[PDB]
RNA sequence: UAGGCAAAGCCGCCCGGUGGAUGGCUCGGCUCGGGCGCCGAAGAAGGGCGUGGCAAGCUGCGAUAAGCCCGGGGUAGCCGCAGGCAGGCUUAGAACCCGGGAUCCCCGAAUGGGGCUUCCUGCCGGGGCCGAAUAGGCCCCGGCGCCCCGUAAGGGGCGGGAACGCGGGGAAAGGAAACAUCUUAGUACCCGCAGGAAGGGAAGCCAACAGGGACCCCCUGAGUAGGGGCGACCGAAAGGGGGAUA
RNA sequence: CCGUGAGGGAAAGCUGAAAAGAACCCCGGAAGGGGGGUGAAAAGAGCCUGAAACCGGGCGGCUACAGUGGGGCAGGCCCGAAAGGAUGCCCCCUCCCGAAGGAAACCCCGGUGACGGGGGAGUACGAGGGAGGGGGUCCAGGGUCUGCCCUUACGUCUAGAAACACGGGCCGGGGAGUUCACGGCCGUGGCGAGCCUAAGGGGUUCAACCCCGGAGGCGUAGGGAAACCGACAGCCCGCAGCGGG
RNA sequence: GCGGGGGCGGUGGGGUAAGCCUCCGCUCCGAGACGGGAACAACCGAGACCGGGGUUAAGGCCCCCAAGUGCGGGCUUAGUGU
RNA sequence: CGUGGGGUAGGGGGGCGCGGCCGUGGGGCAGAAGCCGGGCCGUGAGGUCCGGUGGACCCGCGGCCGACGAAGAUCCCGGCGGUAGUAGCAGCGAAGAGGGGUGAGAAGCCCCUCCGCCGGAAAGGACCAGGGUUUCCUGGCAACUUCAAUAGGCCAGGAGUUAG
RNA sequence: GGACGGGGAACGAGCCCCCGCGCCCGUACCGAGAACCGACGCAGGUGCUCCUGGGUGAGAAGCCCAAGGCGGCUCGGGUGAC
RNA sequence: CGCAGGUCGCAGUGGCAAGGGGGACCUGACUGUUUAACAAAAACAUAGGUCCCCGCGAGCCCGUAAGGGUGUGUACGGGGGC
RNA sequence: GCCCGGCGAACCCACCUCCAGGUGCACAGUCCUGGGACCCCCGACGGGGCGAGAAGUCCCUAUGGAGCUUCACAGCAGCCUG
RNA sequence: GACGGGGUUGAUGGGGGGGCGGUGUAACCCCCGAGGGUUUCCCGAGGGGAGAGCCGGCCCCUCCCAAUCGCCCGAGCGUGC
């Protein structure tokens, strides 16, 4: 099937000129599609809030070492019992390193920047305007338990979209804003 | 002081994901009315196994296996559900429908005898094969159930069918504001036996001194007579009107 | 499919008019993504519409010195196209009328006094109802927050529920005074000392409808176990109504 | 509907007493909003169609909280009491 | 006109909605039903209109009839949450490591070297019942295996059981 | 299998050589800490039902090692608080 | 299987394997069985003792009946109690 | 156990609750009067939430059962007798 | 999580040297060894001398190795009382 957009091609230059005072148009805009992803729903969101805002090259980077074990990823909704860690951002203690999530991320923005040469824009100045992920269907599957009954145990694939915007590279931001708090 | 100025979080709207409501639809159900009504030793119903070029299920069919033959209708397509890939059939008249035939594995009343595996196995008679052989063995085909009728020849019964029909055996729960007689109920259910219906049917009748005139079914008589811890409750018949009439 | 067995037993419908079922290009290990196409419309085979619960993003309001929900009033920020008013709404000013109610200053009388009385004065004013002038621009309505005032989830039994009384995680769909027979009664309709046909029969445009069918049932007379017997306009009071004063 | 209950009164009668048991009467709650009582079915005031204005009831008038740090006389030293 | 205006159980009187039927009048591909938001009307049940979506039916009025109105029944069926990226994937006396190869991808698949466990056996040889193709070969990884996978009792295709 | 009897033929063996026939059904694999039953790739049960080398040893005990198998009682790494 | 000599350790059945012992009371003689899934016991059974119904066409028991069990038995026996 | 990587549930859930003293269906997160608290996150525990599980088996009631007893009310076999 | 110290102008961890310490005297070599036989140059439990050997989640010294390369946060302005 075909899954739509959290926001259109109209909407996505509205937010480019609201955010950063360019206008541009549905040309400047390519997309990506990762439908049904095997992989944990609540650190694709928290991947998805992260990523937002930086360039297609920084956001390859940062993915890049939380393969390996490098840099966290924060955690800031779906932190219940979760570990406090040492960060190299600054207001957020609770972070993780997920491996298989990043990696499928990846491969999208992989896809995405593949978009984005194939109508001509340029990579350094394509910044992620939009991201999110989407709980998609159940796998569903039972864990037998003790005195006979069974319980679920499911696998909850994840839908990911994500848009990028190439901008005037006088506005792309040169460094990672990592200020939690202020982001 | 307040704003730029933001954490986690809360509320509302919009978009997206999930979900399958709603609405529309309907070759399905349900109810009612009319019709029609038995099949099986000439081996049934039911079941197993098998059968399609690619096919697992359903449907059909049975080693001649989604089919074979004949006739009537039907003329140009066809090879089921079932929209694919091939190859065919068909104008020498197919597909399709209707009537008549053929084939119809194993188990099945199953009926030569068994059957702890829907498979196995015996005797007689005929045929065939291995074999030097007419020996011996192996294989195919036919007959071989019980109880009966008949001089015999020969013939009958057996099992099945949604409900209805006839004979017999026969509760309890519940009700009675407890409960035993009682009711529930001659019911549920069981055993046996028929038909397309069955059963009933042709005055040792009903009546009341006046007369009806076999039987069944419908309306009524009637919840009347009567039965009954005369309680709960149960409960006619004659007679009259009809269907039909022998 | 479940049970050794006797037996028990689901879920599950929808492409489009036509596959025209998505050519071709880039990326991906692949599912698949992007671009580009078909189609009136993706309606895309996980296929009509596609709600809520739920989850993600955007937007609006709040957010780390203040105890939460609902209502009223006031304000901040935001929306306020249509369907509502804009002949509106608010401010000021001016005029008039004005219910119940109703001052003050100041003068006089009294009390230690808080205060009372005569006048001022039924006055200024007063809910609301009319008219006009100028100014402004949206007003009504909605979201969210803040301030002040008010405020003890729901359903249930109970004398008594916010109860430490019991039931519900949420949302969608489903979910409970029916029918017959008999009896009482009511509201109407037909006929009326009579009323109605039942079964059934004929016809029909065929379960409708027209016509026939009075058997029977109830009423017209009661008393008595039964045999048996079997009934009023005479008088008075008097509502309505009528006639007389 | 045939489970009632609260207050007051009959030293009701019983009981050590009981927010106790069982009778008699008015009223209220149940089935009655609202103001006061610090909260509080039945104690005091009062009976609510909707909006507004006014005046009072119970009770209150130093602050919380509308209205008096109101007036005269006397008592209390215990923060008794409010 | 009323020194009329509280009200549970209950009695009485009127109205709104849902599905169909008998009539009557209409709308709809120039967009019906349904769905999301909003304005207006009505004390109210509700009605009606606007914008978006949708794609073929529907509605006003009179009469009649019902399988006719939900917030609840430890209600039934389905879906989906917070809990929560949490519990568990310890215990029952074995366990892995290095190098190479394959592969998109390798701690885990194949090979060698080292290390370990059983050895009258949770473990080697045989085999009954039961199971019924799980056996062998090839290929694969959408699902299954408490993690992974290129592995596999899994999936797809083909093959296999010989008696005096 | 042997013996003991009766009957029959003119042939004839349990010895040697040579010739012919032997149908039907089962036969793969697990046989269990993943192929059975227990809803499961389940620490239970069925079946340890039968069999198995060396050293020590009373020993079919335990411990070590053969033959033979296994690292699949199907998560991995770090830290070294309570 | 024994004897003699020498010699080391904290420890010589050095690991593995592998009884703590004694006195007394209650109670059931003993071995045995038992509430699968909260009771293993002093409960049940037991050998031994004793009593009763019975000479077989018996006694006791089963079946609607046909008939059956004890009984292919016989008082040193069958059945029934404690 | 904790931290990291991977898989990834359930119980429970009207909403969801800082403390003191009162009031109230007499044992309040929600009412009254006060005392406090910058918010968010982690680990742990088990005082509270009359914590969760289970329509209390204890007690009573019902003109409710079942099983057992007999000197209950009745009845039926069986045996004896005419 | 945090906290503390150092981070090349450096002794922060390792290597090497030294100190202190634990155990208990390694290999080799020499002597003895109950007794036996290849009579005595052999076997033999074991004992003595010299040498200890092994080891340190401690201290000192010494730049031989590594404390690198890098990646981020960060006030700045207006308003009124
Ligand atoms: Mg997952
Ligand atoms: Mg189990
Ligand atoms: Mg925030
Ligand atoms: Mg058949
Ligand atoms: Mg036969
Ligand atoms: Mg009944
Ligand atoms: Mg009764
Ligand atoms: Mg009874
Ligand atoms: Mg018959
Ligand atoms: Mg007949
Ligand atoms: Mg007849
Ligand atoms: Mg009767
Ligand atoms: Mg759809
Ligand atoms: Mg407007
Ligand atoms: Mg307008
Ligand atoms: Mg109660
Ligand atoms: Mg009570
Ligand atoms: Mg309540
Ligand atoms: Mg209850
Ligand atoms: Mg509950
Ligand atoms: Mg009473
Ligand atoms: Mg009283
Ligand atoms: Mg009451
Ligand atoms: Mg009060
Ligand atoms: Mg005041
Ligand atoms: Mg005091
Ligand atoms: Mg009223
Ligand atoms: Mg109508
Ligand atoms: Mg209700
Ligand atoms: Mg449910
Ligand atoms: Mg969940
Ligand atoms: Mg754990
Ligand atoms: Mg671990
Ligand atoms: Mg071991
Ligand atoms: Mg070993
Ligand atoms: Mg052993
Ligand atoms: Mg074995
Ligand atoms: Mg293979
Ligand atoms: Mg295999
Ligand atoms: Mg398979
Ligand atoms: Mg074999
Ligand atoms: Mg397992
Ligand atoms: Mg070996
Ligand atoms: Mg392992
Ligand atoms: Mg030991
Ligand atoms: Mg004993
Ligand atoms: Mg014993
Ligand atoms: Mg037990
Ligand atoms: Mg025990
Ligand atoms: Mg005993
Ligand atoms: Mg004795
Ligand atoms: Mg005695
Ligand atoms: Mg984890
Ligand atoms: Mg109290
Ligand atoms: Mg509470
Ligand atoms: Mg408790
Ligand atoms: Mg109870
Ligand atoms: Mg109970
Ligand atoms: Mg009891
Ligand atoms: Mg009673
Ligand atoms: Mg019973």
Redesign the pocket.
Known sequence: ???????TDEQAAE?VF?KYGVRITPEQI??????????????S?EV??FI?GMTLKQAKAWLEDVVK?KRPIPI???????????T???????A??????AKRYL?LL??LE??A???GLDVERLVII?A????????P?????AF?????????TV?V?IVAAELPKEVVPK????????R
């Open positions: 099937p075909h899954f739509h957009y959290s926001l937010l609201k390519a997309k990506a599609y990762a439908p049904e992803q095997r992989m944990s729903w609540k650190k969101v998805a809030r937002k074990l800031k909704t779906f932190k219940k019992k979760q570990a406090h860690h040492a190299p951002w600054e207001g957020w203690p609770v993780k390193w997920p491996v298989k999530v491969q992989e896809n593949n978009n040469k194939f109508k939009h999110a992920a989407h709980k998609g269907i159940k796998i599957n039972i864990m037998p338990r006979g009954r069974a319980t679920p145990f499911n696998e909850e839908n979209e460094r990672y804003k990592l200020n939690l708090v202020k």
